[PDB]
């Protein structure tokens, strides 16, 4: 996260860290959507242009964390993966279209003050909140500049009009994406960056005071460049695939 702030304890109890076994390192963010399921970006697991192709046994998820590097004894839970699901039509060749994956934990994790699942949006929630100018919140332990924070970082960013998102890049944008960030004249900054991938973009519903995950940190050109924007996987547009995977498996 670039130009963010230190999160508060308990601020994002759905935040998940994907952690590589060996070497031991930070892969990505992710989010807890139930006792048994974790949502993240497909490009965190699979991206052949960088020879990235992780499987169940290469990774651990770490839930309940604040510090990037400490083992937060008595606080964090570390879980192993039973299975990974990547969207069948994930387009890693071109524009990261459908950048989404589900992960099934080996055993359910116990909820606590620091661990708690975020809601998935329904059609009406999405229609109401997913609007240019409305702000969401992005969290992660990723790079501070295009060096690495000691604790979880947070930043709030406005959703940007689709035509402006299109006009900022050569990349083909699709309906499964939205972009977010301040424009160059708005005089505020911030973006996700490397190591933030797969993290949740969340909004708080004014109607029921609940937190909803609207996006997944997907891609960008650099981090926090003027005239560029962060792109996010559009969670509700892919929700059918999500429901399909879950109650089938």
């Amino acid at each position: 996260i670039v130009e963010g702030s230190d999160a508060e304890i308990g601020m994002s109890p759905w935040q998940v860290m994907l952690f590589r076994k060996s070497p031991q390192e930070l892969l990505c963010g992710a989010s807890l959507i139930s006792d048994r399921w974790v949502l993240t970006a497909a490009h965190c697991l699979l991206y052949p242009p960088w020879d990235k192709n992780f499987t169940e046994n290469d990774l651990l998820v770490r839930i309940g964390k604040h510090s990037r590097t400490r083992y937060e004894r008595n606080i964090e839970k570390i879980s192993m993966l039973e299975k990974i699901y990547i969207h069948p039509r994930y387009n890693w060749r071109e524009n990261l279209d459908r950048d989404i994956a589900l992960m099934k934990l080996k055993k359910p994790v116990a909820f606590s003050d620091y661990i708690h699942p975020v809601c998935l949006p329904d059609r009406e929630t999405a229609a109401s909140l997913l609007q240019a100018g409305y702000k969401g919140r992005v969290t992660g332990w990723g790079n501070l500049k295009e060096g690495q924070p000691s604790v979880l970082q947070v930043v709030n960013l406005p959703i940007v009009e689709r035509p402006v998102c299109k006009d900022s890049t050569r990349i083909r944008i699709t309906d499964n994406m939205f972009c977010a960030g301040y424009k160059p004249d708005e005089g505020k900054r911030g973006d996700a960056c490397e190591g933030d991938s797969g993290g949740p973009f969340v909004m708080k519903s004014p109607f029921n005071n609940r937190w909803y995950q609207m996006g997944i940190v997907s891609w960008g050109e650099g981090c926090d460049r003027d005239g560029k924007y962060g792109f996010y996987t559009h969670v509700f547009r892919l929700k059918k695939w999500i429901q399909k995977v879950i109650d089938q498996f």
């Binding site: 508060e8 909820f111 708690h116 699942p117 969401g136 709030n156 708080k204 609940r210």
Partner: peptide, 26 residues
């Protein structure tokens, strides 16, 4: 079912330092 309600905030009716900024943009 209990999703999106944080034990240390919503559940205690405490607000985090910047959630106001979100609600205001709505």
């Amino acid at each position: 079912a209990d999703c999106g309600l944080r034990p240390l905030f919503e559940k205690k009716s405490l607000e985090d330092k910047t959630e106001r900024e979100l609600l205001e943009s709505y």
